[PDB]
Amino acid sequence: TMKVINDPIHGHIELHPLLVRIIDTPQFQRLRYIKQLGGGYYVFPGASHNRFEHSLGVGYLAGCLVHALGEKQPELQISERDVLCVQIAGLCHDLGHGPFSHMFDGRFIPLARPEVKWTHEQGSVMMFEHLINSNGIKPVMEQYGLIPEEDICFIKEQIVGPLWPYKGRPENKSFLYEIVSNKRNGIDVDKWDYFARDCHHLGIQNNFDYKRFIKFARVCEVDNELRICARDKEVGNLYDMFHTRNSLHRRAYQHKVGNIIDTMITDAFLKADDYIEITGAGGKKYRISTAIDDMEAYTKLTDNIFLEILYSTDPKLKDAREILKQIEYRNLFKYVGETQPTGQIKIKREDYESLPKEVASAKPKVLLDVKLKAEDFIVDVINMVSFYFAEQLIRVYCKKVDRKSLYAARQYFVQWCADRNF
Amino acid sequence: TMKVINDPIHGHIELHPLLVRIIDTPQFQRLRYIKQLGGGYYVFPGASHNRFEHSLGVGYLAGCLVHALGEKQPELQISERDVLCVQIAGLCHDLGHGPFSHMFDGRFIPLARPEVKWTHEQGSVMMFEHLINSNGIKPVMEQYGLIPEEDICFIKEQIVGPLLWPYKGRPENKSFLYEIVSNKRNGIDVDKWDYFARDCHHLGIQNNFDYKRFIKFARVCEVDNELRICARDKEVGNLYDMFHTRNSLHRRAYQHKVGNIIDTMITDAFLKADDYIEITGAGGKKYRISTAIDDMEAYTKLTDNIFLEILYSTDPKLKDAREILKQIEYRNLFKYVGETQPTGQIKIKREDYESLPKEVASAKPKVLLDVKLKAEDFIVDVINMDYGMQEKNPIDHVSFYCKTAPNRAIRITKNQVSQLLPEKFAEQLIRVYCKKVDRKSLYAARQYFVQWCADRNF
Amino acid sequence: TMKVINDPIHGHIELHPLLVRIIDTPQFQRLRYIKQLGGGYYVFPGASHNRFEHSLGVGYLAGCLVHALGEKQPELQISERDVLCVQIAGLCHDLGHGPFSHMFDGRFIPLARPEVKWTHEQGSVMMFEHLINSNGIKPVMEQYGLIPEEDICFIKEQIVGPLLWPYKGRPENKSFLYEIVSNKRNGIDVDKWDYFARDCHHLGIQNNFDYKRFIKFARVCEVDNELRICARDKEVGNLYDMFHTRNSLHRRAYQHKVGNIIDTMITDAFLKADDYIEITGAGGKKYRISTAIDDMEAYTKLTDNIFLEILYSTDPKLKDAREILKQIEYRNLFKYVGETQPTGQIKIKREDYESLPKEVASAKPKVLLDVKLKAEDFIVDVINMDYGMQEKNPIDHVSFYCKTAPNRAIRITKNQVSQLLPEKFAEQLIRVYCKKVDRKSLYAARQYFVQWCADRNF
Amino acid sequence: TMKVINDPIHGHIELHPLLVRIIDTPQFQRLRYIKQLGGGYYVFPGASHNRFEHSLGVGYLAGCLVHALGEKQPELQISERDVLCVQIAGLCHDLGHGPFSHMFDGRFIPLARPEVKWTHEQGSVMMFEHLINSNGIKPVMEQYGLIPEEDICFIKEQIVGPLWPYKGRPENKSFLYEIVSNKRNGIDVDKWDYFARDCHHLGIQNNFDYKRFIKFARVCEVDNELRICARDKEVGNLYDMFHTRNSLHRRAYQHKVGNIIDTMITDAFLKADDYIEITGAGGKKYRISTAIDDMEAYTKLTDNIFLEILYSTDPKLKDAREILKQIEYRNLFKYVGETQPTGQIKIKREDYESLPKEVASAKPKVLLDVKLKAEDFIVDVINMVSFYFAEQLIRVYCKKVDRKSLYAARQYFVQWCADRNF
Numbered sequence A, D: 001t002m003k004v005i006n007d008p009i010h011g012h013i014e015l016h017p018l019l020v021r022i023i024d025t026p027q028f029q030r031l032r033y034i035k036q037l038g039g040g041y042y043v044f045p046g047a048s049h050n051r052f053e054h055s056l057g058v059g060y061l062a063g064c065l066v067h068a069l070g071e072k073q074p075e076l077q078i079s080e081r082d083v084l085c086v087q088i089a090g091l092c093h094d095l096g097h098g099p100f101s102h103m104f105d106g107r108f109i110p111l112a113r114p115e116v117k118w119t120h121e122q123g124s125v126m127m128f129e130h131l132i133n134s135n136g137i138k139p140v141m142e143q144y145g146l147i148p149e150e151d152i153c154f155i156k157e158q159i160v161g162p163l164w165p166y167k168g169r170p171e172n173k174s175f176l177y178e179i180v181s182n183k184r185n186g187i188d189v190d191k192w193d194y195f196a197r198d199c200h201h202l203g204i205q206n207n208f209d210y211k212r213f214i215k216f217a218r219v220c221e222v223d224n225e226l227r228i229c230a231r232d233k234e235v236g237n238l239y240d241m242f243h244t245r246n247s248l249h250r251r252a253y254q255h256k257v258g259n260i261i262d263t264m265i266t267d268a269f270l271k272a273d274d275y276i277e278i279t280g281a282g283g284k285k286y287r288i289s290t291a292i293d294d295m296e297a298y299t300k301l302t303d304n305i306f307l308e309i310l311y312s313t314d315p316k317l318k319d320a321r322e323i324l325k326q327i328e329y330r331n332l333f334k335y336v337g338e339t340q341p342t343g344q345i346k347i348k349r350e351d352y353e354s355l356p357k358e359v360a361s362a363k364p365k366v367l368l369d370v371k372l373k374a375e376d377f378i379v380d381v382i383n384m385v386s387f388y389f390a391e392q393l394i395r396v397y398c399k400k401v402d403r404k405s406l407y408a409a410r411q412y413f414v415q416w417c418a419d420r421n422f
Numbered sequence B, C: 001t002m003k004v005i006n007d008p009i010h011g012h013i014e015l016h017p018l019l020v021r022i023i024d025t026p027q028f029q030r031l032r033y034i035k036q037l038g039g040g041y042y043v044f045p046g047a048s049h050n051r052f053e054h055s056l057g058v059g060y061l062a063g064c065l066v067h068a069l070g071e072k073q074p075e076l077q078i079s080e081r082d083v084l085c086v087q088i089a090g091l092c093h094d095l096g097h098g099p100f101s102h103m104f105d106g107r108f109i110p111l112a113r114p115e116v117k118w119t120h121e122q123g124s125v126m127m128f129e130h131l132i133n134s135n136g137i138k139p140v141m142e143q144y145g146l147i148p149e150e151d152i153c154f155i156k157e158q159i160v161g162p163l164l165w166p167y168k169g170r171p172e173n174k175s176f177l178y179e180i181v182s183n184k185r186n187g188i189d190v191d192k193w194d195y196f197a198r199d200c201h202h203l204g205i206q207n208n209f210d211y212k213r214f215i216k217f218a219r220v221c222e223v224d225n226e227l228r229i230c231a232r233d234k235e236v237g238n239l240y241d242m243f244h245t246r247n248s249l250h251r252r253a254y255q256h257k258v259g260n261i262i263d264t265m266i267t268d269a270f271l272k273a274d275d276y277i278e279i280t281g282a283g284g285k286k287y288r289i290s291t292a293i294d295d296m297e298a299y300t301k302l303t304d305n306i307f308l309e310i311l312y313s314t315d316p317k318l319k320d321a322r323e324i325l326k327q328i329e330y331r332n333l334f335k336y337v338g339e340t341q342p343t344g345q346i347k348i349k350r351e352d353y354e355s356l357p358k359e360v361a362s363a364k365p366k367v368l369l370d371v372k373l374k375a376e377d378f379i380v381d382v383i384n385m386d387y388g389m390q391e392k393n394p395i396d397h398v399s400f401y402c403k404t405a406p407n408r409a410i411r412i413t414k415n416q417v418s419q420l421l422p423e424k425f426a427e428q429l430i431r432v433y434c435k436k437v438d439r440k441s442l443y444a445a446r447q448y449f450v451q452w453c454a455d456r457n458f
């Protein structure tokens, strides 16, 4: 029957039997062992939470918002079927996350397989489909009044993106396609849950109260179409929310130590590739960078690889183990410097691999006692309204920490940075 | 070279350079991968904190308390070396915890190697010895004014008991320093002041006890011809409320039925997965999970990783553990059959634990049952609840002082405070489960349990 | 049309237009000038809240509770009429409070007028009738589906109680509605759910009780032909916890000794200032401070302002009260001498407080002291701390239900929970204060106190 | 002896015996009956705190800050006398506020006594002088090592304004004058306590953390003047503080209903004056307006006067009694045009009482059969960096509420706006 679950951020959360049956599966339970902040744990010791609670809270918030909108305006004709669909769509919106959350799909894939464009939302939808097919959820959905043929496509459109290109639901229910994921302005339950959880656990003060926003929720006919909006006196609250997210990003998400630790972890993983085998269906052996193509082999791809490399004994993982130990002793790669936003031409996804080669290839005018190779430079790339903006940061890090190497490495930056017109 | 750390519970924790140097070692960083509550993460989804923060907070609290006590009475002759030694003893007091914190030393070792008695304090002592020996910390301790020869022994006696004033670390006029981190005369020490706040913040429960007020009214007097920490006579109710809050937390979170059953299943999986997992230690030797306690190098590589190591294995020999772990994933746990009224006559000893399932299986229900149950499909657990002194009153050993004569020690009995305090301070709970999960088995198990409980007159 | 108001403890409260119409009246707005804790503002500087927000919060809590109960079980036939009646009853339950809240009706009235019985509930009811009759609210109530001839009587009954099945406001199948604003059977309601949070927020003492969880597990079990709100069988510990927290708050903040002595001095100042303050009531009559409880028109002008009216006066007739309040303003308080440990007798009745100073004064100590103390210089205070039902276990009148059959109610004894529960639920306390402030007088008073306590075997 | 006092914001606080002796006097105890927010209580029911705890918190914060600053640099030669003097100054900074603490000196005095300038700092310093003179505290001050003649002057210069005009200390200890009341940019303990207490009570959350600022507090001799030089990485924290201040000011202090009630009660007091009489030294009698010239008469001036007017019985106070009855019945005045913001040109302080007459003198080009005298119109006047901005708003309010008057009142408003070029 109805299941009550505790949550430090929110209160007691009720779970529909369908959601309870969905959670109790290996595919969703796998989220217990993936970290919300990934590499930010080693810089904020008090941040050690996973995606399980994040998904639960996102689903709860989406359900609450949909129920409030439905009750406050009975003529929109929102049925419990839509409520179940939105809740299930908000529960399974992060199933595709790899190890260390954003670090995997942001920094490991491009340096491993440049010819495949992959974002974790496609992984999420594939994992959701595999879960539904394997666990036999469809009969239950039919039992509870949900139509699999339409509902599955509606959920898929809710998770990933697409004169109405959507086919899950008719155009008169447009607002339902923004509650979980909003592609137009960037306001939905998901960012609210990030803000709340990060502020609570990390230890930062907050400014945005989502309940006040929920109170003044109306579905107007703005833009010759149905659309969510905010009351005319909510400008201050909206700008406060924007300032809160910007402050969170600057204070936590872009810390020097977090990014450097992520960089060394990624280097260790890349060097350790082609030696760890994960068995999928039929005994097929996949590598770390090729396991996405098979979901059963991808399920066993969690944060355990870090410890598997760390405690490995075979001589084939010598360098990766060495790099992990370097991380452990708190003797990190030395920070070199930063360059103003690239500006004008933008760095493409598949350009990451070539960047270190160009820096080494640059020949500084001054004389350098020590010659640097293409493996001595690692570069980190960071990407930054009804009331009825982006930049790229590039950082360069050097493995060697000796005085001579830093001075020799510094000359490469000045010569290369000026040459590329940053 | 003084560092800073951020903690959600406390504010900014300040670290002496020697403490920072000690923190960055594998033996200490190993704590990042051990759950505080162990199996409680599978009931309270919001409880996923590690021992790293707990150790940091305990060290900070000990340092702050010793600093405050020294500043209150500048005649005690407290020096920098004393504060540093206290902080170090407070930072390395839980290094001996195995996977899933208390589950290991509470359920596995007594079942895997019943020939010896082992507690995590001894493991902490051995790991501290290994850390100091192998990480080359003695020269730095000498540099920073400490004397390793006596300081190491002082830290050891701080962590563990004395092993006629027996302590050989400090003179007799410094006996108040031995009741800050781990207090043996009573439970008043800076361990609870940390984990109470941490667990209440993470689990989702409020806390009733405040420690800053207690620190504001602390003094050292001459109880029994020795200097020991002394409290104010207007704080007896506060201490009783401290212990009541401890009991409430233990009864609400740490002793949950589902958490206990999950821990039992994990212990069973570990037992069935033993003799097949090999851990490399010193000299290339191979140790098992249970035997790894005999080597520090092999024990260092023992963390929570074993759960996933067994769960995602593919060897034919680890099927018996993978089945149980998958059953955990699918949430097909054991069923709760019933419970017995708490205590009243006698407390069951440890040696009698193994005989409970057979005894309950031997019960004969009056009404014939269409289902026959075996003696191996029953689980019986015993829980002990007390104030930390096994039927004694902990406050009896606390010395109070007045304001007219602050330098005098007095003792306050139980009848001089209130009439609403608990009469007893110890009890036992007995839980009975079953492995079969079909309705007929549940009915038969209920009949068996009721008959057994009525047989011995609980 | 619905108005939204902001309060700190809760979130945002929506007010029905009828509730807003009732609120904006002189009688209700009077509550803005009464302090909830009264004498506790001179010991806890941060407790300066009033009764207005307390009433608002109680109304909100009652509305939410009845809404949830109606939503969960649809076979009860709960309409908006009952919801509005309950909200009005919970919004107008503390209307009759006097200056300094409980101090007035606890000390001044029993002394000023010792020939009549008066509890603030009757005053609140009388203020309710006066408000409704004077402001012409009956037409507005009729406009919104209410029938005043019955809803008014139901609202009256919900506050005080009855004046077989005795009630008359609703039929016999709506009995559960009488256990939401103020419960008489055991004492679980929303009043001791709102002021807990408010007091613990303002004072600074953290709270442990959680009411949302209790609301989430509330049902009606139809116990003994009497539809009653019934909780779940696993919430016994939480109920004992809330009662323990209430006892802790009473022992900590409300029953502080300094606050009690300040209240006693304020009451003495009021008594000595009486017969010299005139308040004009209905028809042009003049009422004293003590007699104002007879004409509500004059009573509406009796607030905390009397303290400052006496304090800043200049009439020589008010020299005594002005002097006493000025001493209150210089912290020249009466001193504290001693405290007889909880008396091991049956009890001391209310009508026997007068003789205590005479008996303590008349005690002849074994030792002889030159200083003599008169019987008018001793102040004796008797304090009561219990669970709120005169040595009866409150949890004995609460009905629980199991998971398998939520429609069946059962009862639980004290032995089936734990052995650590308190043995007794009632006690007494006695404090003695000496008006004289010089050392010899207070020492003599302490000697007299100890000899007197020894005489009566405390 | 030492005294420990429990505060709901800053926690347990320890009080020096001298400060405890200072507290227990009528002059300091009168603060218990003066509300911090004044007339804003009727908008937010949860804001019912006084200035007593505010002053206590300010003193505690000043003591902690000075102690930490002295400890962190043993080369400053900070003595206990400086700490005691700073704490005393911080305990007697809001000692001059009258009823409601901002209505009086902000609006009431200019309307009744436009020929005299009177800020609340003058009241605070005068009351402090009277307190010390009449409570015999000078011997007590000398008992603990404080020189009365110099320390009293130092405290006076601390509360109010004076190549070194300050006389208490030489130029060496110049940084001591920017702790309790800062006038260059506006960072001080008083505003910290304002923000913390107001956010805690009203039910708002703030993003400022003063503990970090205290930790990173240092003094560097900028351009030959010792200042409180903070670090270079807390520009974000300073931005957070300023954002919190702006949000608080735009949310709580500048609420429309708060200001309408403020002006309403101020007019009630003005109509009630000339009939309320207060006694001072020698039996001399004073009114509300002229009480500011008599400290002993001032000490008996608190919010009791509001109820005195409300609960009066003499016929001569009928109008004020009716006005307060309107306040109680929520028969508020009309928000009748919200005159435009500043135009550089700023209204002089002493011309406030003339503006109501100006509006009635306008001649709008609309058919206004009804005649409205100036007596039925009311106006409100509003107001608005070391590392190691003003505008005035005008609002218009109408005593009458009849719809017929609404049309006529608006016509003068627009015409007066045109006439005044606002």
Ligand SMILES: Nc1nc2c(ncn2[C@@H]2O[C@H](COP(=O)(O)OP(=O)(O)OP(=O)(O)O)[C@@H](O)[C@H]2O)c(=O)[nH]1
Residues within 6 Å of the ligand: A003, A004, A005, A006, A020, A023, A024, B042, B043, B044, B045, B258, B331
């Ligand atoms: N089902 C489930 N419960 C969880 C999970 N995580 C935390 N919980 C909590 O743990 C509790 C376990 O309850 P159940 O799984 O129902 O087990 P039980 O209550 O002993 O027996 P049943 O209710 O009959 O299944 C739930 O009430 C949840 O609040 C989870 O992932 N799945």
Ligand SMILES: Nc1nc2c(ncn2[C@@H]2O[C@H](COP(=O)(O)OP(=O)(O)OP(=O)(O)O)[C@@H](O)[C@H]2O)c(=O)[nH]1
Residues within 6 Å of the ligand: A042, A043, A044, A045, A257, A330, B003, B004, B005, B006, B020, B023, B024
């Ligand atoms: N040393 C250390 N710091 C930690 C740890 N966990 C979190 N931190 C925080 O991470 C920050 C990074 O420390 P460092 O590695 O020394 O970085 P850094 O201070 O810029 O480098 P240095 O100036 O050379 O010391 C510290 O200031 C800590 O607050 C830990 O386990 N060890």
Ligand SMILES: Nc1nc2c(ncn2[C@@H]2O[C@H](COP(=O)(O)OP(=O)(O)OP(=O)(O)O)[C@@H](O)[C@H]2O)c(=O)[nH]1
Residues within 6 Å of the ligand: C003, C004, C005, C006, C020, C023, C024, D042, D043, D044, D045, D257, D330, D332
């Ligand atoms: N009526 C009323 N409002 C209060 C009270 N206490 C706080 N408030 C708040 O003060 C606000 C101002 O009240 P009003 O003067 O009625 O202004 P309003 O809310 O715009 O209502 P209208 O003027 O009738 O449109 C309300 O929104 C309430 O939330 C109170 O005791 N009575």
Ligand SMILES: Nc1nc2c(ncn2[C@@H]2O[C@H](COP(=O)(O)OP(=O)(O)OP(=O)(O)O)[C@@H](O)[C@H]2O)c(=O)[nH]1
Residues within 6 Å of the ligand: C042, C043, C044, C045, C258, C331, C336, D003, D004, D005, D006, D020, D023, D024
């Ligand atoms: N002195 C003083 N204490 C206050 C005030 N407000 C709250 N308190 C608290 O109330 C307590 C009263 O203590 P005291 O005034 O010292 O009286 P006492 O404790 O009964 O005995 P003495 O210390 O001899 O005066 C103090 O400890 C404060 O913590 C105040 O305005 N002045």
Ligand SMILES: Nc1ncnc2c1ncn2[C@H]1C[C@H](O)[C@@H](COP(=O)(O)OP(=O)(O)OP(=O)(O)O)O1
Residues within 6 Å of the ligand: A004, A005, A006, B043, B044, B045, B204, B205, B252, B258, C403
């Ligand atoms: N007193 C409590 N305070 C806070 N959280 C609690 C408390 N008791 C349990 N929780 C946690 C445990 C779960 O996460 C959730 C509620 O679970 P709980 O009520 O114990 O259900 P359960 O599965 O043990 O029993 P059942 O299904 O029989 O009601 O909140």
Ligand SMILES: Nc1ncnc2c1ncn2[C@H]1C[C@H](O)[C@@H](COP(=O)(O)OP(=O)(O)OP(=O)(O)O)O1
Residues within 6 Å of the ligand: A043, A044, A045, A204, A251, A256, A257, B004, B005, B006
């Ligand atoms: N402004 C901030 N607000 C909250 N937490 C912060 C802030 N700045 C840093 N932290 C966190 C990060 C770390 O956990 C700890 C302090 O780290 P931080 O000050 O960034 O040190 P650092 O290693 O970058 O530099 P340094 O060695 O110069 O102190 O607190």
Ligand SMILES: Nc1ncnc2c1ncn2[C@H]1C[C@H](O)[C@@H](COP(=O)(O)OP(=O)(O)OP(=O)(O)O)O1
Residues within 6 Å of the ligand: A212, C004, C005, C006, D043, D044, D251, D252, D257
């Ligand atoms: N920024 C804020 N955040 C939260 N509560 C606020 C804020 N500003 C004001 N409040 C308070 C004021 C009221 O108590 C409640 C909301 O009232 P508010 O929306 O200002 O109504 P109002 O009477 O001014 O206008 P209206 O009738 O147009 O809604 O919350």
Ligand SMILES: Nc1ncnc2c1ncn2[C@H]1C[C@H](O)[C@@H](COP(=O)(O)OP(=O)(O)OP(=O)(O)O)O1
Residues within 6 Å of the ligand: B213, B234, B403, C043, C044, C045, C205, C252, C258, D004, D005, D006
């Ligand atoms: N348990 C408590 N927790 C927090 N604050 C408390 C508690 N009890 C009292 N307080 C408040 C009351 C005062 O505001 C302040 C200190 O009071 P308290 O220590 O009781 O002094 P006191 O004057 O009654 O005692 P004494 O003079 O005997 O030391 O703390």
Ligand SMILES: Nc1ccn([C@H]2C[C@H](O)[C@@H](COP(=O)(O)OP(=O)(O)OP(=O)(O)O)O2)c(=O)n1
Residues within 6 Å of the ligand: B036, B037, B094, B101, B102, B191, B192, B195, B199, B254
């Ligand atoms: N039966 C259990 C189960 C788990 N916990 C967890 C909760 C706490 O976070 C942690 C306590 O850590 P410590 O080892 O420092 O405290 P102890 O209880 O082991 O020592 P003490 O004898 O002082 O109580 O153990 C517990 O205390 N007891």
Ligand SMILES: [Fe+3]
Residues within 6 Å of the ligand: A054, A058, A093, A094, A190
């Ligand atoms: Fe997400």
Ligand SMILES: [Fe+3]
Residues within 6 Å of the ligand: B054, B058, B093, B094, B191
């Ligand atoms: Fe510990």
Ligand SMILES: [Fe+3]
Residues within 6 Å of the ligand: C054, C058, C093, C094, C191
């Ligand atoms: Fe009440």
Ligand SMILES: [Fe+3]
Residues within 6 Å of the ligand: D054, D058, D093, D094, D190
């Ligand atoms: Fe101030």
Ligand SMILES: [Mg+2]
Residues within 6 Å of the ligand: A093, A094
């Ligand atoms: Mg995502």
Ligand SMILES: [Mg+2]
Residues within 6 Å of the ligand: none
């Ligand atoms: Mg550094």
Ligand SMILES: [Mg+2]
Residues within 6 Å of the ligand: B093, B094, B120
């Ligand atoms: Mg331990």
